[PDB]
CSV table of N, CA and C in Angstrom, one decimal:
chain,number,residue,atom,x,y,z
A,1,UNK,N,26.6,23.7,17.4
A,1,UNK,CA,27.9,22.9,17.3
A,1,UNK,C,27.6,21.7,16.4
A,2,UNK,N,26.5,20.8,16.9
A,2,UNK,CA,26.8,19.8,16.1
A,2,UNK,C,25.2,19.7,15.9
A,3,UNK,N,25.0,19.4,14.2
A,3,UNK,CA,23.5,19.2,13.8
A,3,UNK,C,22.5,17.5,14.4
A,4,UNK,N,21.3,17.4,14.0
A,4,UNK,CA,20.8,16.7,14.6
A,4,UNK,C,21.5,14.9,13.6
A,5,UNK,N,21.5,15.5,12.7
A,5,UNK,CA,22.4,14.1,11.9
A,5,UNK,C,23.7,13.8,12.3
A,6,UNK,N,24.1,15.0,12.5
A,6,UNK,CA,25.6,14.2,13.2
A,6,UNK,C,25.5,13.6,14.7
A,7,UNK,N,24.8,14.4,15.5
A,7,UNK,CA,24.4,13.2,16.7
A,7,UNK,C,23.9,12.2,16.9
A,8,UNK,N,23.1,11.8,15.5
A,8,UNK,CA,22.5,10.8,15.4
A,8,UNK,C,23.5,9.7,14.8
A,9,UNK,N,24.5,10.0,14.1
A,9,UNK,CA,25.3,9.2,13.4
A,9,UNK,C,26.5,8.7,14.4
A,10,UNK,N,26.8,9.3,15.3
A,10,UNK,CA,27.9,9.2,15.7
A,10,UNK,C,27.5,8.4,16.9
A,11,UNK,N,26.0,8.6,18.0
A,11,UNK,CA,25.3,8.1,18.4
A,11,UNK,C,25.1,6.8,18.1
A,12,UNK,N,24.4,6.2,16.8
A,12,UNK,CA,24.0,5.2,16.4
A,12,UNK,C,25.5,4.1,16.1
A,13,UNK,N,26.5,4.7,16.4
A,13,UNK,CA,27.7,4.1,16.3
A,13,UNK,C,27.9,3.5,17.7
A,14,UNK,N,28.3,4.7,18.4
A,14,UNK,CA,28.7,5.0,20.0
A,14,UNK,C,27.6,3.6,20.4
A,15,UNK,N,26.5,3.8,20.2
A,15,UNK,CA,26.0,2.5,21.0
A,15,UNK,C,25.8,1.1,20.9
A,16,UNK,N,26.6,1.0,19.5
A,16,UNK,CA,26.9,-0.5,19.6
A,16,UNK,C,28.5,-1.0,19.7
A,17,UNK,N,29.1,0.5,20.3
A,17,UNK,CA,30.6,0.6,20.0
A,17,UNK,C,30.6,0.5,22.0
A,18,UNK,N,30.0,0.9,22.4
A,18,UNK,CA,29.7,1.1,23.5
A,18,UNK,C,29.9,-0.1,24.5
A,19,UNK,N,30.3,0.3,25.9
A,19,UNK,CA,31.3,-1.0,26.8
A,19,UNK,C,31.6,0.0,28.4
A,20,UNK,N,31.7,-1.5,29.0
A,20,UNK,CA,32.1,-1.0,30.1
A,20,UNK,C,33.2,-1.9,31.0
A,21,UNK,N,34.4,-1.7,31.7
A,21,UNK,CA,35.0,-2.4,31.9
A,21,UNK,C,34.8,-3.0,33.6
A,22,UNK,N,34.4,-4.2,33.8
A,22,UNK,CA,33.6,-4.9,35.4
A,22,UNK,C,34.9,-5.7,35.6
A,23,UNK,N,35.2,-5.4,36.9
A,23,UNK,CA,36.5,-6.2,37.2
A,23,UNK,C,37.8,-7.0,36.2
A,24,UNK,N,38.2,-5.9,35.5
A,24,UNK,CA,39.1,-5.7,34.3
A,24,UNK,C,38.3,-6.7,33.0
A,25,UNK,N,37.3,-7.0,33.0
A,25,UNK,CA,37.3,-7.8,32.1
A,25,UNK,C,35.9,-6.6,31.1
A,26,UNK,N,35.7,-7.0,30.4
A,26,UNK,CA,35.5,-6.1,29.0
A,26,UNK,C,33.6,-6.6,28.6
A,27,UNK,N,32.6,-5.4,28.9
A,27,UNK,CA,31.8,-6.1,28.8
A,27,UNK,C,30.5,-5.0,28.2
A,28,UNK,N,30.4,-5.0,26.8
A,28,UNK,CA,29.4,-4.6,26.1
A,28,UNK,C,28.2,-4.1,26.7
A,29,UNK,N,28.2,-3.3,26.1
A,29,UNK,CA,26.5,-2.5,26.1
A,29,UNK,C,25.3,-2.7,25.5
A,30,UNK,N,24.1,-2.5,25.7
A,30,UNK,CA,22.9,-2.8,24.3
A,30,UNK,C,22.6,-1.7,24.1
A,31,UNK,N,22.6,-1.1,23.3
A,31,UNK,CA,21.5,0.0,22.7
A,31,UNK,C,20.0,-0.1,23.3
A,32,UNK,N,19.5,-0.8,24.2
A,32,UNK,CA,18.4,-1.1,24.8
A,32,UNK,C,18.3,-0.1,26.0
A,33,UNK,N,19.8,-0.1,26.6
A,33,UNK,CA,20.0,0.8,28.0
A,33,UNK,C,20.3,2.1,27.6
A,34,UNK,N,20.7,2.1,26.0
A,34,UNK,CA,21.0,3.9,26.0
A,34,UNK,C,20.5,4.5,24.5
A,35,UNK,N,19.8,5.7,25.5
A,35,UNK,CA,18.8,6.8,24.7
A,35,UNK,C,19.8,8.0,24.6
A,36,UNK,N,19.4,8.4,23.5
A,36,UNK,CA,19.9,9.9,23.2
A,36,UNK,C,19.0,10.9,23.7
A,37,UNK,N,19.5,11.8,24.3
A,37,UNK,CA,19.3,13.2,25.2
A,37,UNK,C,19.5,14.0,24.2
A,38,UNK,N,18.9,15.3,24.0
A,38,UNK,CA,18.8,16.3,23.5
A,38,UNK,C,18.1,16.8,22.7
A,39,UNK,N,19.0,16.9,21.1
A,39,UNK,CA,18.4,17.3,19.8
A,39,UNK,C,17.2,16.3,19.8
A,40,UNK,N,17.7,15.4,19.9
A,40,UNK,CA,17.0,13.8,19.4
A,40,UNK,C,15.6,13.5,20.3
A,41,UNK,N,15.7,13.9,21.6
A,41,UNK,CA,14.2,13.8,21.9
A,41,UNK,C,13.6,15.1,22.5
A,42,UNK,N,14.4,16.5,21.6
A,42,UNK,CA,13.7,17.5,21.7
A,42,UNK,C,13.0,17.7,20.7
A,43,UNK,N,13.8,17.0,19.5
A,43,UNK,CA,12.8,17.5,17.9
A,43,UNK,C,13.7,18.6,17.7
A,44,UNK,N,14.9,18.7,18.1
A,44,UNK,CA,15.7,20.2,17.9
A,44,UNK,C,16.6,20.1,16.2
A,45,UNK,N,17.1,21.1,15.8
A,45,UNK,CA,17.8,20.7,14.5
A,45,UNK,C,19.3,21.1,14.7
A,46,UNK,N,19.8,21.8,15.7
A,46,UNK,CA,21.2,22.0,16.0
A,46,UNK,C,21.5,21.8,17.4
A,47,UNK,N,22.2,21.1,18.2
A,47,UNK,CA,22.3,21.1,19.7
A,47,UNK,C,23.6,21.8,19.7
A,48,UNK,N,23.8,22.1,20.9
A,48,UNK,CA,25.4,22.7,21.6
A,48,UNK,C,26.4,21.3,22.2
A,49,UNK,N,25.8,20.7,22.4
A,49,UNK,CA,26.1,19.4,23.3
A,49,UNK,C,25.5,18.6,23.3
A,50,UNK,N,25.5,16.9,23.1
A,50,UNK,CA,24.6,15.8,23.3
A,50,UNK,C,24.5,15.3,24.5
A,51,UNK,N,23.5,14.4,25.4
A,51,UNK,CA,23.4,14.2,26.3
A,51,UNK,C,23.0,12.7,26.1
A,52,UNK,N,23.2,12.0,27.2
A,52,UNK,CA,22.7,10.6,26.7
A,52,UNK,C,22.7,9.8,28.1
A,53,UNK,N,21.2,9.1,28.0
A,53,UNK,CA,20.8,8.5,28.9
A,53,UNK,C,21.1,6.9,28.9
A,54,UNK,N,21.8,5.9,30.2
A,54,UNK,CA,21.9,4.7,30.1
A,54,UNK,C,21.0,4.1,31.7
A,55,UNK,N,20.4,3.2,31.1
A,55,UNK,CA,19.4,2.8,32.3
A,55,UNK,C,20.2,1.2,32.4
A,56,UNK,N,20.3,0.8,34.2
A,56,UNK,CA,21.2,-0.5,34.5
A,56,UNK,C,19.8,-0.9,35.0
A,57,UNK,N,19.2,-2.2,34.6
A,57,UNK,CA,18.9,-3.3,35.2
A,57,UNK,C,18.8,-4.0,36.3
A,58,UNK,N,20.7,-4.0,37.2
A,58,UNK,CA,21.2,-4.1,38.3
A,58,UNK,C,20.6,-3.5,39.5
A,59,UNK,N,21.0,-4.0,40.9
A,59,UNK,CA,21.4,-3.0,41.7
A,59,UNK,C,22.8,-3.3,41.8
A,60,UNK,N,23.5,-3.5,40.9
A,60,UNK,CA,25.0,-3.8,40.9
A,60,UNK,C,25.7,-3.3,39.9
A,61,UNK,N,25.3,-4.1,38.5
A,61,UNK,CA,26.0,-3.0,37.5
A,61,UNK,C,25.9,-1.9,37.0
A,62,UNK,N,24.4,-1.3,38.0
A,62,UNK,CA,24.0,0.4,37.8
A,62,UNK,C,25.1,1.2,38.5
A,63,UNK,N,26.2,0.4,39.7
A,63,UNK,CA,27.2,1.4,40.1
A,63,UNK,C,28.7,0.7,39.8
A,64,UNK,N,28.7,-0.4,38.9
A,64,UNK,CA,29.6,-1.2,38.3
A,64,UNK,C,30.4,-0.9,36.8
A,65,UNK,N,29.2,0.3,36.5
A,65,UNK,CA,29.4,0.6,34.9
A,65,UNK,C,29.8,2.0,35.4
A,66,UNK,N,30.3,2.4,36.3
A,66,UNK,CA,30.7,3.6,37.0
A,66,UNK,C,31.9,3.7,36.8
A,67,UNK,N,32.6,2.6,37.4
A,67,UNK,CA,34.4,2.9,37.1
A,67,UNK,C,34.8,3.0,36.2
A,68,UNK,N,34.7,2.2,35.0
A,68,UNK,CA,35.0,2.2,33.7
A,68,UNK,C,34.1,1.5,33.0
A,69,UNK,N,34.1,2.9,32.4
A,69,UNK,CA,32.8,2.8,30.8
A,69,UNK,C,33.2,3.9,30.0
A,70,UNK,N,33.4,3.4,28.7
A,70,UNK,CA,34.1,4.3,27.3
A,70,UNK,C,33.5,3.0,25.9
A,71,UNK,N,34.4,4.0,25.4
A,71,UNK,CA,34.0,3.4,24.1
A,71,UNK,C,35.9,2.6,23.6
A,72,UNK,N,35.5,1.9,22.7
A,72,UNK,CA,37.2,1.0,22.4
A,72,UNK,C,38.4,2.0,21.8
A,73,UNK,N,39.4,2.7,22.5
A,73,UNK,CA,40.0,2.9,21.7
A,73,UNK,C,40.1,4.4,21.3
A,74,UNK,N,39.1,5.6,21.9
A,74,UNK,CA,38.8,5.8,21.1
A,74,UNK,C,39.6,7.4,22.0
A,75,UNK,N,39.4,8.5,21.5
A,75,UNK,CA,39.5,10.2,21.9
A,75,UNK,C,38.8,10.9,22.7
A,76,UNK,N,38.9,10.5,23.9
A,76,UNK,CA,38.1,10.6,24.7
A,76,UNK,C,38.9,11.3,26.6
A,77,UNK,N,37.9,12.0,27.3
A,77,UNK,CA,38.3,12.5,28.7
A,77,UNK,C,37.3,12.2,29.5
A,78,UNK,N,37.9,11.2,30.7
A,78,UNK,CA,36.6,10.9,31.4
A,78,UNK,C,36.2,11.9,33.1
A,79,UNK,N,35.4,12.9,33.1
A,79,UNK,CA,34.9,14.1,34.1
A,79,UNK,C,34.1,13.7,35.1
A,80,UNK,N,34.0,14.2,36.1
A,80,UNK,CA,33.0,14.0,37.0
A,80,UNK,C,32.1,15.5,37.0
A,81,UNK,N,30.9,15.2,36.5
A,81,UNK,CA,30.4,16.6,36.3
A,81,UNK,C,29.1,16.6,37.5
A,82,UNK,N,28.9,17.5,38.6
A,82,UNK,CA,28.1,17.5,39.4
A,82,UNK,C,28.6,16.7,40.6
A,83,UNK,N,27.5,16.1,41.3
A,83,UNK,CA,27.6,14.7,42.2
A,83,UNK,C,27.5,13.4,41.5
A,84,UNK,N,26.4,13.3,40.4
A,84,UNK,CA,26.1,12.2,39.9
A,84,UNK,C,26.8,11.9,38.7
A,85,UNK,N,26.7,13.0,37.8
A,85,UNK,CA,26.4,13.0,36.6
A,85,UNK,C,27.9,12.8,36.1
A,86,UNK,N,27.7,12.5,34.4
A,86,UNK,CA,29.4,12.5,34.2
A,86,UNK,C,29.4,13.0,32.8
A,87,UNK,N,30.6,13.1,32.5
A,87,UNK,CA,31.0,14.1,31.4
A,87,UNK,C,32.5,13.7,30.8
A,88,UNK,N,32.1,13.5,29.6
A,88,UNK,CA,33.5,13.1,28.7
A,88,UNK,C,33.7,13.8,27.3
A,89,UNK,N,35.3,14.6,27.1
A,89,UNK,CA,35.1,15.3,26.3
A,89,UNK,C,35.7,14.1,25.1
A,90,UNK,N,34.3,13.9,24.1
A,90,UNK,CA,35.3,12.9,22.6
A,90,UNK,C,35.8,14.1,21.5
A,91,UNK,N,36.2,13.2,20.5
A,91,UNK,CA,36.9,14.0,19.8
A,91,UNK,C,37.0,13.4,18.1
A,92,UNK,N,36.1,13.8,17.6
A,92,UNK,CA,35.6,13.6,16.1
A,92,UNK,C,36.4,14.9,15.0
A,93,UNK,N,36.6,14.2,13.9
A,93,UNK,CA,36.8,14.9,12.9
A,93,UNK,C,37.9,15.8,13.5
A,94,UNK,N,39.0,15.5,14.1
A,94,UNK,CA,39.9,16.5,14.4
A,94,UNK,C,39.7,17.5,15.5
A,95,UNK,N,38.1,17.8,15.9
A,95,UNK,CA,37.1,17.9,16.9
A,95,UNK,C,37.1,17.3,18.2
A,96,UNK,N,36.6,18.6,19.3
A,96,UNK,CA,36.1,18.1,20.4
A,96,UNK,C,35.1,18.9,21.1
A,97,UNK,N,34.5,17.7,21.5
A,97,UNK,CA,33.1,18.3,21.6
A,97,UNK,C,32.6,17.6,23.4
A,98,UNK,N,31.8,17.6,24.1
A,98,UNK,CA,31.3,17.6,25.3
A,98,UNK,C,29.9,16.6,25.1
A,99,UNK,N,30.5,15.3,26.1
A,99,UNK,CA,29.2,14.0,25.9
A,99,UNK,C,28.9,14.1,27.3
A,100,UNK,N,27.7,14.2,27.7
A,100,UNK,CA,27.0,14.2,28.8
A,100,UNK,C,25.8,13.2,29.0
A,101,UNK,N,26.9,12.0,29.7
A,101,UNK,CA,25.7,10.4,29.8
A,101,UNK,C,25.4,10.8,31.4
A,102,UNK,N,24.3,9.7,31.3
A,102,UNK,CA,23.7,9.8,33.1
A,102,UNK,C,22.8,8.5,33.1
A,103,UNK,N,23.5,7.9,33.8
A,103,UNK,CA,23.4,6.3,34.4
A,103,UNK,C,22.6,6.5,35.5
A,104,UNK,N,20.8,5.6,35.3
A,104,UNK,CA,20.1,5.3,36.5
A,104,UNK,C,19.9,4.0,36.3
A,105,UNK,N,19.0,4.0,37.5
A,105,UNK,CA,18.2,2.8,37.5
A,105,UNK,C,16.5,2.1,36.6
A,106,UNK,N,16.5,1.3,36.3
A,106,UNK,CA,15.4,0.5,35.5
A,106,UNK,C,14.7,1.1,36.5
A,107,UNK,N,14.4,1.5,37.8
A,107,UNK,CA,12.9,2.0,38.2
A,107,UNK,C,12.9,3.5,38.0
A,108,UNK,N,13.7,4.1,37.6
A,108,UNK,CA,14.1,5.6,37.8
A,108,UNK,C,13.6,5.6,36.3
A,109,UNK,N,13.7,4.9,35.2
A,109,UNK,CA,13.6,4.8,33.7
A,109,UNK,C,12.5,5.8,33.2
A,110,UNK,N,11.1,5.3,33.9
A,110,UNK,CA,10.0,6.8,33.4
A,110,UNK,C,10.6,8.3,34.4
A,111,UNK,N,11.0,7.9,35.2
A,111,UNK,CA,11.2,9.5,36.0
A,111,UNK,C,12.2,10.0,35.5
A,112,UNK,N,13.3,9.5,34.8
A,112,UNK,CA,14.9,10.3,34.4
A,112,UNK,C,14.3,10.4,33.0
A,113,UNK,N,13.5,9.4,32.0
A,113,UNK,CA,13.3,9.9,30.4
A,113,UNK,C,12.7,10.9,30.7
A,114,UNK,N,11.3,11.4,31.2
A,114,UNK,CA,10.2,12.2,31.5
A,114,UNK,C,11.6,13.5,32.0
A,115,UNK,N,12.1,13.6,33.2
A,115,UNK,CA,12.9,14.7,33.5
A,115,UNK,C,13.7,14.9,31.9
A,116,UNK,N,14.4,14.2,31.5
A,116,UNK,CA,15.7,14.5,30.7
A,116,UNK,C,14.8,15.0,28.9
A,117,UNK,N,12.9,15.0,29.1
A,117,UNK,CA,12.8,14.7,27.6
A,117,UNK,C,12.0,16.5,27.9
A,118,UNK,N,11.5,16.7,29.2
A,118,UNK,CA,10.9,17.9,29.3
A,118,UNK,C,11.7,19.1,29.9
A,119,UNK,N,11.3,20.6,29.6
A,119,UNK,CA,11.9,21.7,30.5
A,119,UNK,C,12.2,21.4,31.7
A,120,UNK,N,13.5,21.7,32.1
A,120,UNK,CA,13.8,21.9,33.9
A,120,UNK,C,12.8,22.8,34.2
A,121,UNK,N,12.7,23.6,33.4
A,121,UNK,CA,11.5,24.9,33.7
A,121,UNK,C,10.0,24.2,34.5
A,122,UNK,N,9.9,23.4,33.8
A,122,UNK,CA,8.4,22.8,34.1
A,122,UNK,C,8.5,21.9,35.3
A,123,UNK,N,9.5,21.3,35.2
A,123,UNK,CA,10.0,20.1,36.2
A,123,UNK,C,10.2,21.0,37.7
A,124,UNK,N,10.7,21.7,37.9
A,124,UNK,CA,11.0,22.6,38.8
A,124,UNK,C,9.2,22.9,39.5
A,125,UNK,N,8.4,23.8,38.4
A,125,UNK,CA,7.4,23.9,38.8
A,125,UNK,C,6.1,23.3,38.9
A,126,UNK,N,6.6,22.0,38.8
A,126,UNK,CA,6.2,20.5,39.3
A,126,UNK,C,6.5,20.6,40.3
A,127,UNK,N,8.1,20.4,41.1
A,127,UNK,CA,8.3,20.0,42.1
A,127,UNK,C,7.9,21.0,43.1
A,128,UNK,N,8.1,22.1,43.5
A,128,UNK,CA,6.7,22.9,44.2
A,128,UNK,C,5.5,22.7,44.2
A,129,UNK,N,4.7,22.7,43.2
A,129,UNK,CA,3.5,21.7,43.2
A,129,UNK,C,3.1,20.6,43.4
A,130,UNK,N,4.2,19.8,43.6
A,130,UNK,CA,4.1,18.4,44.6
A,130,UNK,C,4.4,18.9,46.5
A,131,UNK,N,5.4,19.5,46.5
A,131,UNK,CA,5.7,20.1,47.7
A,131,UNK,C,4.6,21.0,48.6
A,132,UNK,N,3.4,22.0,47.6
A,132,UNK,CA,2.0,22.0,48.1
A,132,UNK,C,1.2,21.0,48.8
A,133,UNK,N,1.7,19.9,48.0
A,133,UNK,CA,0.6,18.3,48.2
A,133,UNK,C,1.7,17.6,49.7
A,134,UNK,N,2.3,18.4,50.0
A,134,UNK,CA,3.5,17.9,51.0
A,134,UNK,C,4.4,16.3,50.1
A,135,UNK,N,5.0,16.2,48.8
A,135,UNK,CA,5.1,15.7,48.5
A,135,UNK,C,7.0,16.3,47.6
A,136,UNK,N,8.0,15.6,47.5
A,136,UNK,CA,9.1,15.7,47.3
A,136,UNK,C,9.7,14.8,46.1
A,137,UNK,N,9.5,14.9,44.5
A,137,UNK,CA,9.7,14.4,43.6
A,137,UNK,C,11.3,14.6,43.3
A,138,UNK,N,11.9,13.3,43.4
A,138,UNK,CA,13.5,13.1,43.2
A,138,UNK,C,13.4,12.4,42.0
A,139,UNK,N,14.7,12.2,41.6
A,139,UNK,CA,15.4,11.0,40.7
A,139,UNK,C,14.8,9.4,41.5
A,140,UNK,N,15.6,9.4,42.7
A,140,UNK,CA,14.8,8.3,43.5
A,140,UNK,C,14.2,7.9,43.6
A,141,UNK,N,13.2,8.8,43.4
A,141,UNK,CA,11.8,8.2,44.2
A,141,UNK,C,10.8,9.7,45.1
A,142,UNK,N,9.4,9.3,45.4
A,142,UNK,CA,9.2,10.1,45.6
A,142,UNK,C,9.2,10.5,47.1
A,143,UNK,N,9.6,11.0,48.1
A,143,UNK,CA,9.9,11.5,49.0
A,143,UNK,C,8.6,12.5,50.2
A,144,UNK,N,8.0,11.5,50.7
A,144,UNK,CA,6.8,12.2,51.8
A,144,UNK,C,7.2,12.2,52.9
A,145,UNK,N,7.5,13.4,53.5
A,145,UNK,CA,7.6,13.5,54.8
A,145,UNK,C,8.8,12.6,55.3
A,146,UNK,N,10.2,13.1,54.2
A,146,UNK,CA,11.1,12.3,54.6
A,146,UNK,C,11.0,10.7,54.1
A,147,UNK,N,9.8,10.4,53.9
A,147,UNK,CA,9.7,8.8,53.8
A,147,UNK,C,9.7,8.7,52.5
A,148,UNK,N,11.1,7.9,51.7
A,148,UNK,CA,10.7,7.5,50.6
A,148,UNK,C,9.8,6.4,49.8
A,149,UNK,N,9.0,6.5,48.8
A,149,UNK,CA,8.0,5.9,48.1
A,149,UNK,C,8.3,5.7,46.6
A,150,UNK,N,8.6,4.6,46.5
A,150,UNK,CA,8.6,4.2,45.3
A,150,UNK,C,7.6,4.1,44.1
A,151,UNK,N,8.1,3.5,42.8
A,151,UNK,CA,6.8,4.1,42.3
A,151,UNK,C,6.5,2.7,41.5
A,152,UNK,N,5.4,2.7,40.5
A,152,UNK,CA,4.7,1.1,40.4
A,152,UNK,C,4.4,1.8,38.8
A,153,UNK,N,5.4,2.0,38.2
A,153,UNK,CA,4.7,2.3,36.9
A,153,UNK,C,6.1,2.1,35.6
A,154,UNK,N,6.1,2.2,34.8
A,154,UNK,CA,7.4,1.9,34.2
A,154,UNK,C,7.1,2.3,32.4
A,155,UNK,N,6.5,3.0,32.3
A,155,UNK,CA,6.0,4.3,30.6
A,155,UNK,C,5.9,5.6,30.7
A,156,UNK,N,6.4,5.8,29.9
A,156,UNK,CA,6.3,6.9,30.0
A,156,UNK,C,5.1,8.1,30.1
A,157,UNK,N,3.9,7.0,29.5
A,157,UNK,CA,2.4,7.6,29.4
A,157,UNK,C,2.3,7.7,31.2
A,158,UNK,N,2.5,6.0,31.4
A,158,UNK,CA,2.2,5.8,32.9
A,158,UNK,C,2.5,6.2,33.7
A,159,UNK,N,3.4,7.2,34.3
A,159,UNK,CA,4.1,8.0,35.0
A,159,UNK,C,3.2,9.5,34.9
A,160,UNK,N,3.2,9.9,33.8
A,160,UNK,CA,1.7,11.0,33.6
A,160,UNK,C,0.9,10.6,34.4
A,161,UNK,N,0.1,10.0,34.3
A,161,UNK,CA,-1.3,9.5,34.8
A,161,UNK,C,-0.7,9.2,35.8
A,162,UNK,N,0.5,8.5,36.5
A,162,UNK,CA,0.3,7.9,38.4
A,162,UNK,C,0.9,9.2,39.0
A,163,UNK,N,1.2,10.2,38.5
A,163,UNK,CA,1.6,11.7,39.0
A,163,UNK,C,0.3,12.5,39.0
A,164,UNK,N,-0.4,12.4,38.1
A,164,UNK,CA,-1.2,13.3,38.1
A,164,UNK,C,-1.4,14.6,37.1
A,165,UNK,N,-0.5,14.2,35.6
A,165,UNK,CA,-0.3,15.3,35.1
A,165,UNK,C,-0.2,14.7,33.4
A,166,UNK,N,-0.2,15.8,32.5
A,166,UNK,CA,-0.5,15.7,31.3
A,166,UNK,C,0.6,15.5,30.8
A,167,UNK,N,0.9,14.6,29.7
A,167,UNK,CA,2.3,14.7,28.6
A,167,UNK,C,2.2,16.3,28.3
A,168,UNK,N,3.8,16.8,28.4
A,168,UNK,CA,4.3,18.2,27.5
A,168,UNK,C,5.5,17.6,27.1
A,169,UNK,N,5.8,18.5,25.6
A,169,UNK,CA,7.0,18.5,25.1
A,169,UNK,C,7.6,20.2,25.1
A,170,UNK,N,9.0,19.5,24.9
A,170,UNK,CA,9.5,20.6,25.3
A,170,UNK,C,9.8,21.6,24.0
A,171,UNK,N,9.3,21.3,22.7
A,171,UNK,CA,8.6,22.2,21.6
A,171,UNK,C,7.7,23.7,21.8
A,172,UNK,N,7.0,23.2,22.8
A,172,UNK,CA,6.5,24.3,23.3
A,172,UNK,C,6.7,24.9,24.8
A,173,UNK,N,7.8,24.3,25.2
A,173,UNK,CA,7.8,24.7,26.8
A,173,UNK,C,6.9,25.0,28.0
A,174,UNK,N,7.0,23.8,29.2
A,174,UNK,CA,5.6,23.8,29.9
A,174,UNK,C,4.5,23.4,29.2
C-alpha cells in the first residue's frame, strides 16, 4: 500500500503535527515519545499498514492521551482496536489508509520497542521459554508465579542481556 518514503514523510509530519487534547485544553506532542512501527524499524520497502509507537512519561498522561489524541484538523477515524490498542483510519491524497499507534509506559519502553521491532513468531517462543523457567513475560512486566516484577533496565541492548537473550531482527526472522 504505502512505500517506505511515504511513511516516512507523512510520519515525519504526523509527529510534530501531533497533539493530544487533556481536559479540553490542547497539548502537543514530541517526536521523543513517538517511533514509527513497521517498514521503518523492519528495514521493509513496502508496508500494508503503519504502526506507530508513543511512550508517556506519566502515570497520568499515559491514560490522559487516551481520550483525545489526533492530529489538527485533519481526515481522520478514531477505533478501538483490541483491549488496548487503537486504530485510526487517515486519509491522504484522496486516500485511506489504517494508522495503528500503541501508547505505553516509559518503563514498558525496552519491552514494547523490543516486542513491536521483532517477530510475534519469536516473541511467542520466548514467552514459553520463560514459562519453562516458570516465568510470564507481559507488556507490564514480568509476571512469577502471579507476582508481578518489574524491570531495572531501560535500552534496548539492556533488556537482551537482563532477559537472557541475543538481539534478532526481524530481516531474518527469529
Amino acid at each position: 500500500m504505502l512505500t517506505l518514503i511515504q511513511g516516512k514523510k507523512i510520519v515525519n509530519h504526523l509527529r510534530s503535527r501531533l497533539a493530544f487534547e487533556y481536559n479540553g485544553q490542547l497539548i502537543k506532542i514530541l517526536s521523543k515519545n513517538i517511533v514509527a512501527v513497521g517498514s521503518l524499524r523492519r528495514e521493509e520497502k513496502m508496508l500494508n499498514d503503519v504502526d506507530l509507537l508513543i511512550i508517556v512519561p506519566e502515570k497520568k498522561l499515559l491514560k490522559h492521551v487516551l481520550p483525545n489524541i489526533r492530529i489538527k484538523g485533519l481526515s481522520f477515524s478514531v477505533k478501538v482496536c483490541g483491549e488496548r490498542k487503537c486504530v485510526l483510519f487517515i486519509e491522504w491524497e484522496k486516500k485511506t489508509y489504517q494508522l495503528d499507534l500503541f501508547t505505553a509506559l516509559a518503563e514498558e519502553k525496552p519491552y514494547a520497542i523490543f516486542h513491536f521491532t521483532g517477530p510475534v513468531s519469536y516473541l511467542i517462543r520466548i514467552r514459553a521459554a520463560l514459562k519453562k523457567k516458570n516465568y510470564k513475560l507481559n507488556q507490564y512486566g514480568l509476571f512469577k508465579n502471579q507476582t508481578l516484577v518489574p524491570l531495572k533496565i531501560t535500552t534496548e541492548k539492556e533488556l537482551i542481556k537482563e532477559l537472557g537473550f541475543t538481539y534478532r531482527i526481524p530481516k531474518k526472522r527469529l
